[PDB]
Design a protein around this ligand. Structure first.
Ligand SMILES: *[C@@H]1O[C@H](CO)[C@@H](O)[C@H](O)[C@H]1NC(C)=O
Ligand SMILES: *[C@@H]1O[C@H](CO)[C@@H](O)[C@H](O)[C@H]1NC(C)=O
Ligand SMILES: *[C@@H]1O[C@H](CO)[C@@H](O)[C@H](O)[C@H]1NC(C)=O
Ligand SMILES: *[C@@H]1O[C@H](CO)[C@@H](O)[C@H](O)[C@H]1NC(C)=O
Ligand SMILES: *[C@@H]1O[C@H](CO)[C@@H](O)[C@H](O)[C@H]1NC(C)=O
Ligand SMILES: *[C@@H]1O[C@H](CO)[C@@H](O)[C@H](O)[C@H]1NC(C)=O
Ligand SMILES: *[C@@H]1O[C@H](CO)[C@@H](O)[C@H](O)[C@H]1NC(C)=O
Ligand SMILES: *[C@@H]1O[C@H](CO)[C@@H](O)[C@H](O)[C@H]1NC(C)=O
Ligand SMILES: [Ca+2]
Ligand SMILES: [Ca+2]
Ligand SMILES: [Ca+2]
Ligand SMILES: [Ca+2]
Ligand SMILES: [Ca+2]
Ligand SMILES: [Ca+2]
Ligand SMILES: [Ca+2]
Ligand SMILES: [Ca+2]
Ligand SMILES: [Zn+2]
Lengths: 167, 921, 273
């Protein structure tokens, strides 16, 4: 259900916005298919990139580049219907992060990734959900760390409801 | 006489410093044939200062640049000048966008207080801002006169012939005299330069980089009796012209009986049962058609076509519906229908979440057959599970239950060039029963054109005059309520305020009427604008929306339109082999003490050669040059390996109503995709390409491409990255990037191509560029046009020619009468002989030898001459028929016409209309 | 009366105008050619004419270059250049004296001759003519390591390595320590050390400190502060707009100040020109 005018403006965005940084993700936001969070992933990663180590700075150099470039191409003749777009974005996350070894970089900066991930931001944006899911299969120690943080944040924000859902 | 061709790639000339350039006053005079798609700006010639390190704008420049610089759209001739003493540069322009491929006498003068620009001798611009001399004698060595472009690569592409430069300003009579000499050479004291290009190196040295333009033999300076007759503002073809249509109106010999064949497409089941229309329908409708058309000299020959195809018969044929609009989640009532899934579900909402269980069931039911449920995943479109003809509602499955008439027309591939095809559909609208192709479309004679009707409204008592309405549409008749209900707005420039030949339905005898269904006179307040009430409306005319019980007649002007279009376009339908007549009376060129010269127009259909079936000569023009449009068209399917595809909108003659606006009648890379799919970007630097093939491969001479729309942003590549000529032997000559204008057809000359070219490939990096059509013009005496015989004209005079002339026949459309007596009245008409069958006589011209006429240079006001310029060319202000053109005022005798709407001087008759000069009234 | 207005530089180029009588019809403003432009003609008065535009000048301020200055250690080759009459664009050839060569000449071909041009402002374009064993390195930096495959014999070369693989062993100027490095200073890279005949290491290990080498992020369109220094290509031109390929500056991380460390520090940028 991607609006035709919305599609036109996004298409003109991509050919103009540069690869580096996240000018690309900027106006892929506000899309008619409600897909939000790519630009948030950019800002979260870029702001917290100062806390990453040498390997982490490499990962942020090249994973953001993969997603920018791939969203400039996979947004080719993909179906105008929303479910196809959500799948295209999801596959961007999986392929870009896995190709660039998300697991080991996250293992080097577990304490950082825990700070970056927010329970609130997790619910608002689907790309965040794919990010945390890929982290869960990136080492038992890291997955344990993520579980600790997510339950405490959910418990504070939801009160007894979080404990009810956390069987 | 020789002419320079500037290829636009860097060939420039520079006048040698031996000549004393003019300081105080000057006059440039150059014949030129500019091509389409120039670089903006394109300096034809200019005076430049080579010493001014800071202000290069000093000096003057004559060239072609776009008015409305934002979205370069309107390329006009221009004259810029900045004297050494002035503060700003001053630019004046022509009245209209230049015409590519036409010889134009561009003359520009400056007398020291008034700079003026003349196009074909009619003063089109004037400015008094620049005062004083151009440059002081001290700076005389610092001025260089350069032709073909500036040193800044403001290059010009096209022909330049007989450059001339005076050191005085020439009044309009002097420039007109110099134009009529047509390159004749003579030395005058005020002549600095006169160039016949016999020796370019003698006077002009090429600019640096050593690229000099080529020197051809000029085909001609011009042609007497300009035969180019443009239709009016509303009109579309030569039959909308007031002069042409007057001949069909006044004369009764132009409406002789004509038999026109029409074919009825009757679909059938495989067992030859269940007709789409019963034989009673065809017989009854044919009888009613014959009765209505009997009195108007049109009789229809009935051919019935039985197609026994259940796979076509059982499906629902749709009219006015577009398959792309089904399932787009936007409600489309015209594609509503039971077998289309109510627009594929766009127009049918319900408690959808209550149907999740029915998914994955493996059996078709009803609720899952929609686009948001994805049509049950193809269970319903499977012939094995269920029954497609009532279950396969999807617009993508080839087994869908509905077609549209465009696909039905594609399937049948009927010969539309010899019959009027009557297809049958299901018109959902209560307004019309179908769509009839206009005579001025591509498909008028192709397999995709004809008439689509509703079988429920065909041959039924009370519904028979819907086919006669549609037939009138297919013969060029507009709706009588055009101009009020079919106008764009109340400010439409040719809305029919009063009965006229140039507004509305282009039929005077049909009063303005609104879109009204009852055949009483419309009531007060039934007007969209409400400016005037309607009286004596043609409520009973076939072209009105009244019921079949009251519509009974065509007005005599509408009958004239139908017969004009039966000679212009539909010569193929009629079995009669009478060639089309000459529409206009033989014009009088000039008279001597003992003779008179007559030149007449070609026959109205426009063909100069005898019509032979199967030959290519119906495309040949005078001089045996073959001009053809893109027949094939193919362009790779985007984001698909191979894909092939076939963009039929870029075939045939150009059909875009309004250039520079996005249209559906073009090839656009974005249009190549499924509308339910994000359009890709054109591949990097090769571009999306459109292949156009031409029916008759031949040695090309010039290529014309109608680039209707261009996105406005990038550079000067013109969005046409490359053009390749597919040679027959297998080569492919690349022509390099071309500059295009959105409203001027990109013209290219192919003098370098020596091999037979069968097609082109228009590459583009633009995802929004739109190509309307192409055109190949052959060289003179092309092989295919040699054998076919030419049309021959026979001239008949009243009184008859004294010697027993057999008319000696004719081929040149020029007759010199030697036998004349002073003061005697003579009448002339021409009869077109195509083999041995003579056409109807052309309208007569009455020339009284020794007296005046139209085109003698004397304004005989009694004859009706509003102007007279001793000349038979339109566009010089005074029309061919001795009538002032719009926005041109003509003074003196013979007439000197000038463009007054913005000549820098307000006048008496300009006060009420011209705000540019006289201000707000 | 019609106003010709104060005459601008457009009436006569490279001159100043005095208008004692004003700028009205019939006025006459006298022009003087500014140095070094020389007046050529017989009148220098511009009349304000009836059309509203200053009259034509009867004379012009010709631009010219006087005798070029004698370039040190160079001999003029063009005799005509010895005059005091050279128009704009005139070339003068100089030949360096023996034992001298033009700076910027390649080693394979030392050009002993050059040319200069009379530039538009009346000056001349510049041109010149340019003519046992060794002690164990006990005093070493913690991050610095020395590898000696050939022992410590006089003349043996020991490789200087750093604990950080992205750190370079260098020697800074005496006025600049490890943390005192300015943006404009490019330290001397040191790779090997040689013990001389004086029983001493040269350069001394105590003078070598492992300074953080820049990360491989050079030339990735990401202006990062660490690589933004003269030691390595100012982050490969990422931090300066003209040098970067994308023509836009996106500092990494975002928090880096565009007016601070991530500011364009390369002095060869067009913004610095
Ligand atoms: C029909 O044709 C006859 C000649 O056969 C002519 O006299 C008459 O004017 C024509 N009428 C119309 C309406 O075309
Ligand atoms: C009928 O036309 C269709 C095209 O729509 C074609 O596939 C088929 O072979 C034709 N004949 C029959 C008997 O269906
Ligand atoms: C389609 O037809 C159905 C049934 O006639 C109707 O309810 C629906 O409004 C129609 N869709 C349109 C008008 O687009
Ligand atoms: C499809 O329709 C035909 C009509 O004759 C009928 O014979 C056949 O049984 C139907 N098949 C299904 C699966 O409905
Ligand atoms: C046009 O029609 C009007 C009546 O509406 C009539 O008076 C006039 O003579 C007609 N003129 C022509 C040229 O047919
Ligand atoms: C049209 O051109 C395409 C591509 O060159 C070709 O495959 C096809 O056969 C052509 N068709 C005709 C009718 O010439
Ligand atoms: C065009 O010509 C070039 C050689 O100039 C050749 O490589 C190419 O295959 C030809 N065809 C096209 C479509 O480019
Ligand atoms: C130049 O000016 C002088 C006065 O200063 C006058 O005597 C002489 O005639 C002038 N010469 C020319 C060539 O005008
Ligand atoms: Ca729809
Ligand atoms: Ca179903
Ligand atoms: Ca009318
Ligand atoms: Ca077209
Ligand atoms: Ca006359
Ligand atoms: Ca004329
Ligand atoms: Ca005027
Ligand atoms: Ca960097
Ligand atoms: Zn109609």
């Amino acid at each position: 259900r991607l609006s035709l005018q919305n599609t036109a403006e996004i298409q003109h965005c991509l050919v103009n916005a540069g690869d580096v940084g996240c000018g690309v993700f900027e106006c892929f936001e506000n899309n008619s298919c409600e897909i939000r969070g790519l630009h948030g992933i950019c800002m979260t990663f870029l702001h917290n990139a100062g806390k990453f180590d040498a390997q982490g700075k490499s990962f942020i150099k090249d994973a953001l580049k993969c997603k920018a470039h791939a969203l400039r191409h996979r947004f080719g003749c993909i179906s105008r219907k929303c479910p196809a777009i959500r799948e295209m974005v999801s596959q961007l996350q999986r392929e870009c992060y896995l190709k660039h070894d998300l697991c080991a970089a996250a293992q080097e900066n577990t304490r950082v990734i825990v700070e970056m991930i927010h329970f609130k931001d997790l619910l608002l944006h689907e790309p965040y959900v794919d990010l945390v899911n890929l982290l869960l299969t990136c080492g038992e120690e890291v997955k344990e760390a993520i579980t600790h943080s997510v339950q405490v944040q959910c418990e504070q924000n939801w009160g007894s409801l979080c404990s009810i859902l956390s069987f | 006489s020789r002419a320079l061709y500037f290829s636009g790639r860097g060939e420039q000339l520079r006048l040698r410093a031996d000549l004393e350039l003019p300081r105080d006053a000057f006059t440039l005079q150059v014949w030129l044939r500019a091509e389409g798609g120039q670089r903006s700006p394109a300096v034809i010639t200019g005076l430049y200062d080579k010493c001014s390190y800071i202000s290069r704008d000093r000096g003057w420049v004559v060239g072609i640049h776009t008015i409305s610089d934002q979205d370069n759209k309107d390329p006009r001739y221009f004259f810029s000048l900045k004297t050494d003493r002035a503060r700003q540069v001053t630019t004046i322009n022509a009245h209209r966008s230049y015409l590519p491929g036409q010889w134009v006498y561009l003359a520009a003068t400056y007398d020291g207080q008034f700079m003026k620009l003349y196009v074909n001798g009619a003063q089109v611009a004037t400015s008094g801002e620049q005062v004083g001399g151009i440059f002081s004698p001290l700076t005389q060595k610092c001025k260089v006169l350069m032709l073909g472009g500036s040193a800044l690569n403001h290059n010009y592409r096209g022909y330049i012939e007989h450059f001339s430069l005076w050191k005085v300003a020439r009044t309009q009579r002097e420039i007109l005299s110099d134009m009529e000499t047509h390159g004749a050479h003579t030395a005058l004291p005020q002549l600095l330069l006169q160039e016949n290009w016999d020796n370019v190196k003698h006077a002009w040295s090429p600019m640096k980089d050593g690229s000099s333009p080529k020197v051809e033999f000029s085909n001609a300076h011009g042609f007497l009796l300009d035969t180019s007759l443009e239709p009016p503002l509303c009109g579309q073809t030569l039959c909308d012209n007031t002069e042409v249509i007057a001949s069909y109106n006044q004369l009764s010999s132009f409406r002789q009986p004509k038999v026109v064949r029409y074919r009825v497409v009757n679909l059938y089941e495989d067992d030859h049962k269940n007709p789409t229309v019963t034989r009673e329908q065809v017989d009854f409708q044919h009888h009613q058609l014959a009765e209505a058309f009997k009195q108007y000299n049109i009789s229809w020959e009935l051919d019935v076509l039985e197609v026994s195809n259940s796979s076509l018969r059982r499906r629902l044929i749709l009219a006015n519906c577009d398959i792309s609009k089904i399932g787009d989640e936007n409600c489309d009532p015209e594609c509503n229908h039971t077998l289309t899934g109510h627009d594929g579900g766009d127009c049918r909402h319900l408690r959808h979440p209550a149907f999740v269980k029915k998914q994955h069931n493996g059996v078709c039911d009803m609720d899952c057959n929609y686009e948001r449920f994805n049509f049950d995943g193809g269970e319903c479109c499977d012939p094995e599970i269920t029954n497609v003809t009532q279950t396969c509602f999807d617009p993508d499955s080839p087994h869908r239950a509905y077609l549209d008439v465009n696909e039905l027309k594609n399937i049948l591939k009927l010969d539309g060039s010899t019959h009027l095809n009557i297809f049958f559909a299901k018109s959902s609208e209560e307004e019309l029963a179908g769509v009839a192709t206009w005579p001025w479309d591509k498909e008028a004679l192709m397999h995709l054109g004809g008439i689509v009707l509703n079988p429920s409204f065909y041959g039924m008592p009370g519904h028979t005059h819907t086919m006669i309405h549609q037939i009138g549409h297919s013969l060029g008749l507009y709706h009588v309520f055009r101009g009020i209900s079919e106008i764009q707005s109340c400010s439409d420039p040719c809305m029919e305020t009063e009965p006229s030949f140039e507004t509305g339905d282009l039929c005077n005898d049909t009063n303005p009427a609104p879109k009204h269904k009852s055949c009483g006179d419309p009531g007060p307040g039934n007007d969209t604008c409400g400016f005037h009430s309607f009286f004596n409306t043609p409520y009973n005319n076939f072209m009105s929306y009244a019921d079949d019980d009251c519509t009974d007649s065509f007005t005599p002007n509408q009958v004239a339109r139908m017969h004009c279009y039966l000679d212009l376009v539909y010569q193929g339908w009629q079995p009669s082999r009478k060639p089309a007549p000459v529409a206009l009376a033989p014009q009088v060129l000039g008279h001597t003490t003992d003779s008179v010269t007559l030149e007449w127009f070609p026959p109205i259909d426009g063909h100069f050669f005898e019509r032979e079936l199967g030959s290519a000569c119906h495309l040949c023009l005078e001089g045996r040059i073959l001009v053809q449009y893109a027949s094939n068209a193919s362009s790779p399917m985007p984001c698909s390996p191979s894909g092939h595809w076939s963009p039929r909108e870029a075939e045939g003659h150009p059909d875009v109503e309004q250039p520079c606006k996005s249209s559906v009648r073009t090839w656009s890379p974005n249009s190549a995709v499924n509308p339910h799919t994000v359009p890709p970007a054109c591949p990097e630097p090769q571009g999306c390409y459109l292949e156009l093939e031409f029916l008759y491969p031949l040695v090309p001479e010039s290529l014309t491409i109608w680039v209707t729309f261009v996105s406005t942003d990038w550079d000067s590549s013109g969005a046409v990255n490359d053009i390749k000529l597919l040679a027959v032997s297998g080569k492919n000559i690349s022509l390099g990037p071309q500059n295009v204008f959105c409203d001027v057809p990109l013209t290219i000359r192919l003098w370098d191509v020596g091999e037979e070219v069968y097609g082109i490939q228009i590459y583009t990096l633009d995802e929004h560029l739109e190509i309307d059509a192409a055109m190949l013009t052959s060289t003179a005496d092309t092989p295919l046009c040699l054998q076919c015989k030419p049309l021959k004209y026979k001239v008949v005079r009243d009184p008859p020619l004294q010697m027993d002339v057999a008319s000696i026949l004719h081929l040149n459309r020029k007759f010199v009468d030697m036998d004349l007596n002073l003061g005697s009245v003579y009448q002339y008409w021409v009869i077109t002989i195509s083999g041995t069958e003579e056409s109807e006589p052309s309208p007569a011209v009455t020339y009284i030898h020794g007296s005046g006429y139209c085109g003698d240079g004397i304004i005989q006001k009694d004859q009706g001459e509003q102007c007279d310029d001793m000349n038979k060319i339109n566009g010089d202000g005074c029309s061919l028929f001795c009538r002032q053109e719009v926005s041109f005022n003509c003074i003196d005798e013979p007439s000197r016409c000038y463009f007054h709407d913005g000549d820098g001087v307000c006048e008496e008759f300009e006060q009420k209309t011209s705000i540019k000069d006289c201000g707000v009234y």
